[PDB]
Symmetry: D2
Subunit: 419 residues, 4 copies
Amino acid sequence: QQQQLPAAMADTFLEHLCLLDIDSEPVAARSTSIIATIGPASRSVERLKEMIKAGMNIARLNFSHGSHEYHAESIANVREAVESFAGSPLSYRPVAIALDTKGPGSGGLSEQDVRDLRFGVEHGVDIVFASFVRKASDVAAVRAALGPEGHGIKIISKIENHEGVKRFDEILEVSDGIMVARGDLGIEIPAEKVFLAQKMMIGRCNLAGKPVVCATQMLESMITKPRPTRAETSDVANAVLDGADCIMLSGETAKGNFPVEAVKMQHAIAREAEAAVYHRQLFEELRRAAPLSRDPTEVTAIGAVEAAFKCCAAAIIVLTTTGRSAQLLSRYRPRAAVIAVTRSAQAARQVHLCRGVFPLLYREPPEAIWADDVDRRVQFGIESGKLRGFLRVGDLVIVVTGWRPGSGYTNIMRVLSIS
Amino acid sequence: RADVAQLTQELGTAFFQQQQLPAAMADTFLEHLCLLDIDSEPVAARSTSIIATIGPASRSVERLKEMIKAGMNIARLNFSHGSHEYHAESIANVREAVESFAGSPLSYRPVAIALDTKGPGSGPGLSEQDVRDLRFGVEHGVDIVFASFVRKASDVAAVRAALGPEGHGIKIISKIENHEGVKRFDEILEVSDGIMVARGDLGIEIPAEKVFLAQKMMIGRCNLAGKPVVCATQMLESMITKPRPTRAETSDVANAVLDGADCIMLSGETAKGNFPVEAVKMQHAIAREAEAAVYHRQLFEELRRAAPLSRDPTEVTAIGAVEAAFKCCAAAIIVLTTTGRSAQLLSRYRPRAAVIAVTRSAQAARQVHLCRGVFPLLYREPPEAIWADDVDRRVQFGIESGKLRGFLRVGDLVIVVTGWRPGSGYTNIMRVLSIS
Amino acid sequence: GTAFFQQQQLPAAMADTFLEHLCLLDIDSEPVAARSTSIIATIGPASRSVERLKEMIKAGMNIARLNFSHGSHEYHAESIANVREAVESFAGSPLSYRPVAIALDTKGPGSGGLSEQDVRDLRFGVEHGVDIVFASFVRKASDVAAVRAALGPEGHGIKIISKIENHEGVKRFDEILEVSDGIMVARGDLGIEIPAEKVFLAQKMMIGRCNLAGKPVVCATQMLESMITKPRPTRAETSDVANAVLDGADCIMLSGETAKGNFPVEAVKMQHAIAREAEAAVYHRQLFEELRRAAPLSRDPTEVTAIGAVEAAFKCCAAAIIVLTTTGRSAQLLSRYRPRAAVIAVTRSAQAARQVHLCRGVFPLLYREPPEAIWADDVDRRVQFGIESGKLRGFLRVGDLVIVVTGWRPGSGYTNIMRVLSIS
Amino acid sequence: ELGTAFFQQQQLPAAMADTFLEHLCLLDIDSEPVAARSTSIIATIGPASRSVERLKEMIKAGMNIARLNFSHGSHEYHAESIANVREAVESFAGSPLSYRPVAIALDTKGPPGLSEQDVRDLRFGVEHGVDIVFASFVRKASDVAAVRAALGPEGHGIKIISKIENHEGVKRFDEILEVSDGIMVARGDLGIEIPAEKVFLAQKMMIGRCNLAGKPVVCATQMLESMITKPRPTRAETSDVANAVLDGADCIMLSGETAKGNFPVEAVKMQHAIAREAEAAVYHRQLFEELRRAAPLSRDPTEVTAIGAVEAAFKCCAAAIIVLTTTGRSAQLLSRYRPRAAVIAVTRSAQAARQVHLCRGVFPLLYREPPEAIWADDVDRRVQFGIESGKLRGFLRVGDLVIVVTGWRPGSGYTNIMRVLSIS
Ligand SMILES: Nc1c(O)c(S(=O)(=O)O)cc2c1C(=O)c1ccccc1C2=O
Ligand SMILES: O=P(O)(O)OC[C@H]1O[C@](O)(COP(=O)(O)O)[C@@H](O)[C@@H]1O
Ligand SMILES: O=P(O)(O)OC[C@H]1O[C@](O)(COP(=O)(O)O)[C@@H](O)[C@@H]1O
Ligand SMILES: O=P(O)(O)OC[C@H]1O[C@](O)(COP(=O)(O)O)[C@@H](O)[C@@H]1O
Ligand SMILES: O=P(O)(O)OC[C@H]1O[C@](O)(COP(=O)(O)O)[C@@H](O)[C@@H]1O
Ligand SMILES: O=C([O-])C(=O)[O-]
Ligand SMILES: O=C([O-])C(=O)[O-]
Ligand SMILES: O=C([O-])C(=O)[O-]
Ligand SMILES: O=C([O-])C(=O)[O-]
Ligand SMILES: [K+]
Ligand SMILES: [K+]
Ligand SMILES: [K+]
Ligand SMILES: [K+]
Ligand SMILES: [Mg+2]
Ligand SMILES: [Mg+2]
Ligand SMILES: [Mg+2]
Ligand SMILES: [Mg+2]
């Protein structure tokens, strides 16, 4: 069978590895988001359309280079390329915009970072990748620099030195997520210890249910070569197997000769690696480690993921205002795709940070009766799922909704047969 | 500790010291045993049903009212003794005692009526007396038949045929009492509604020292199949003449519950003994202690791993509801059911949360006592004009009765299991509700 | 062969879950291994005759309990003499000789710490060479120290099994177990001191903790009560004996069933038959894994050799682990890991041979030959004696694999070697 | 006691975790590796690494196996490289602390079946006494039989490591592994023959099956590729080396990095540093449990002794397992259970000492003393040689516990004894 299902049914991790089959083709949609750095080699609207088709989910703007005018033009080109597919939900795919800060340099929040963060708020960026975060107060400073208008922007703290690793727990507590920034980390600590920091941080983020990005030199040789090395494909596959929500491309897309091919390579590897995840052990460990909760969204999420595994559900369709109900489903790593139907364009872009969440931006007219409005959003998830290949007639889906309008009231799980 | 820290701060350390919760959080079965505490008091309602045999010592309406208050859920009539007239009078007295509490949902308790057949004797199939007794059962509206000496699938087909078209709703619990019944167990279980480990005859038909193997195997297979299993005979034998049981007897009752029995039974202890009420009270007290000592962490993991994948929405909803109940330490799972099936599918995953089954069927309310942890609530109100409002009223009836009866408190979380259209077979929804 | 893997509940033993293990239990799968849970029989008027005692030894009695709550010192000295006479009547065949321990069960403190009658009874025990003391109503660690002080310097080798019979004993269990050699779950008094419906929790907890500590635990009282007057036990009684073995009890006990009843020999035979069936139904896959995981790291070579030997025995389905032991300690450390292989303990100490009956799965062989001048040849002769006794008793056959556990020098405390041997 | 500092090093908090997720969460960059590097490094010897002086530096950096790629050079060129490896190895024969055996491996050019050039190159290997053959493009069992037949009458002791480089080799993996001594995941050709994004699946599958079979597996090609021209590797390259060790590879390899690059010594040093860190991060609790559960029951005493010895080593945190081996087989059976203790293999065979580098965690000690007339004395002399070399090299100190594995009689094939020794 397909999608490494014989290896998925194994009783031990060793037997799971022994049953991995190169002829077992991946069938599920790619769950791990790809962050591509937008620069000189990937700035044109035409090139950006090809990157979106290749699989780019998040566009990264590196404020260590360029200028405010240069990056504003890159942002406008990303938005133009994204909106060129808005004529049909099959082609349409939201793309988040992330601002990566220059950092503190010689040393706390620098004055250039305050100006760049203000630029991000004014240009409506979705995420901030904060460079060289070494303590909780660095995150509070970034949050303060975003002001009252940037309250919805996600802060992903980049761990790049020994202090960031040692104070990881306090940093994760106040951040929306983490980036394992391996370039600086590999210079700040011995190169042979970076894999320990990566695996530890990914594990702790998976336990906390917060997004984690693996970054830097993943496909480095593709800056000049059309095909990556054996170590590079292995690195991408292992970041997904480690539990990374996102994988990143830096020079490979910002300045390289093969930006589109680098995105295609990360897409192909991630799909293969996701099918090779040993869900039997992973779900059992995530379930056991996740604390008991009296929050109905948390309780519904584990019930929905358990139900999805019981029937081999093709998808879990969830309604979300902020992305939170989809994030709580994602933390249990279901094999079923989490189709998140939202009216918030920003939540649709941001939800790419969570593995296995497929955002659908709802732009249909409202129904007068709220229960009918909910039902049409569910049917929209199903129709978009059928169109995109996620669902077929006869499939079972799990539908996650709330008892009243507004964020924070998810409390219902329903088992539905498609058509 | 981090997996229970926030809930410990919210519910309190006292909450996590009761109902063997430290033993429940253990990482191994050995650690679970080491953490069992005699000072950890049971809090949950008793989930294993008690079947009491009704005979000369327990026939009067006054005595039957005491037995219902002591915990009797199923009244057994042994057709190896008495006559049709004698058993009809016992049935009438049981119904009179049951109806004495029929004035409020907080006081009412349905009691099932089970007919235990005389058996085939030296014959190879259904006896003529059994055909007459089975017809008596249908005419008197019995809920369950305990079929004696079932040896093969065709024996249960014969019992079903003798019940006729009017007894289609009666549950057939096959009694396994000999070597052939044990060897052909899988084919018997497949066609039966449940099983009784009838240890009296089994202990004479096979070596006495092998009965515990047959009991544990049959209970395990019934738990795996999601069908009710009864442990029976000599559980509290010495209580026929003594007011207190032996150390082996209390151990036997506790171990039948730990094995996974849905029901425990009293035969001579209630039918002819000197302490019928005390025997029921003793089974009640032991079952509550033993239910709290069940190692749910391994049990639920093994029930999930062994249960095959399912495309039945009732089955899918049931596992999701039980998982949700464990996540929040839900006080109860309220389920709407017509035939009892949605409650049975919740019961097969052995939730710690009480399964409050709201039904309009008086027969389903009596029969669900066969399933561990199912508390039947008979709803008598006429249907609302709008179906969705009628569903909501039934759920609210379960919540209000749950609060009034001590199952639920303000601040508790409850899991509610319903369907999307009327009629049996459409359960597909799980809701998490906060009690206000 | 396929027949080998159908016996002793081996299909149920290979199961991946406890639920599937239960589902695979087969009443037609006959036990093959020797009975490993020891039987303690209380001696009284129904079991004092030398000829009746010989029948009890043949039926499976391993420990004779003297209940000092009844009778005088003269009565107990006669019981001891009759037990020794019946035991020594089989000594002419050293390959089949079965040692039987003598345990003194104290009257207890009554309304009082250590009573003055207990001091006199304990001194009687030392003077008459008893092997074990079952100390009644132990409520705290200082009760055990008082029993040990009353045994004096001459009774240093006597094992003290603390009887837990009340709420205080259960609450202070950890401190009592730490200073005791073992525990008895004394269910008679316990079932009167605490609610009857809670006794099973105290029993399972104490057995679990004793198994974790690697110390012997006895399940006692009313196990086959109805057999005091009836020839066959009730369904609850056979279930109780089977469940005490499944819980992890090293020993099961008979009180009135052997001391005063009409079927003392049959009560011993019934406990023997049930225990053999229940031992084959133990889910060793989970049990060994959990005992291994819970047992702390050790720098003691006997402890390190024992876990290596038990792992080796499971790897080859060894018929037995033959161990040489002076005090019984090397056999106790093998027993704590609950091997399926019988632990054949060869000793020259008649007292250690009697006392090792406290540990599940230990079969003592008392070696009587004087030492060889070459120590290595004396060790080999003892190992050969274990093999020949094992073949004669049905434990071993030619072609079987056995694990042999010995030490690097004479004297107790130096076990450090494990060897894989093919039986010829 | 060992101290709190002992339990903070070598990822011991992560090793004690109850789940794999908790194990990952407990990995600490400040927890320093203490154990010797157990994954062998194979370095390709070519133009950049051929000189005697450069080879001495490569041996000091950690090279265990010298690979000669017969796709390049000539017989004369490779014979000189072999002579330079042997000269560099023998330059450390005057110091027991610095001396290290180095295996010589011949990697064939490759093929319808065995090529004419491969027959001549295999014959060259036999004549020059090579230890290992890395057979290119093995597609089926008959390709291995052809290589084995080509190793003539003198080379049957040469190890055949089958290189899996195409779709057919992956699909017929089980039949190839059955007849081979080991496997090489030859990722260069594999990444061209099958989609590049599927290579990691083939690598993890083959390593898992080799670990299950107890046969050596090598991870090869482009592990530190950028180090051909750069002094430091990329983040993907260090990750790749660490993950090959975490996957279960016995050996890791360097090709262009040492054969033709500008930093051959630095590439070896980098693989050494990463492997040490990754070996401490192995989750032994799950690995040992799964290796134990998956390995079938065995009646072979070497296999039974090995699992008992590995269990004993884990119980006491043994500094080492010292094993006496003539063929290397007793050390290979210890290595298959992945002990954390270093397996110190004492042998009189120079070829077995070189070949055991294929097995993770085996540290060979070549013993050349004249044999003792009393065999038990000769055994004791070799065990003490392992202990004294262990103290000298930093593996052992007085007061440490070691596990010692020997047999009951001389000659290969009789390992059946495990002993626990305290270092004096
Ligand atoms: N180009 C390579 C090369 O890539 C590799 S490998 O791919 O890293 O194995 C090895 C070699 C060579 C050689 O050029 C060479 C020239 C003369 C003698 C020997 C060699 C040689 O071993
Ligand atoms: O994931 P979030 O942010 O909590 O949003 C989920 C919310 O969406 C709903 O399903 C529908 O809400 P709206 O009708 O306001 O869009 C709510 O019932 C639920 O509380
Ligand atoms: O447990 P059963 O027999 O399947 O009954 C469950 C049924 O009860 C309901 O919850 C309500 O049904 P009714 O309104 O007909 O009583 C259905 O939606 C569901 O199909
Ligand atoms: O189990 P114990 O009491 O520690 O006795 C084990 C001892 O028995 C022996 O195997 C044999 O010793 P003896 O020759 O003194 O009987 C010793 O090597 C070992 O120390
Ligand atoms: O690993 P191998 O090749 O089987 O060798 C192990 C052999 O080594 C020994 O320990 C020592 O044997 P030698 O004295 O012949 O070297 C034997 O007892 C054992 O059979
Ligand atoms: O900043 C980064 O992305 C890094 O250092 O890897
Ligand atoms: O028939 C019965 O109930 C029995 O035999 O136990
Ligand atoms: O003393 C005892 O044996 C008891 O109370 O059970
Ligand atoms: O031959 C090799 O080593 C390869 O192809 O990787
Ligand atoms: K930057
Ligand atoms: K009957
Ligand atoms: K007494
Ligand atoms: K080659
Ligand atoms: Mg950086
Ligand atoms: Mg009967
Ligand atoms: Mg007492
Ligand atoms: Mg190749």
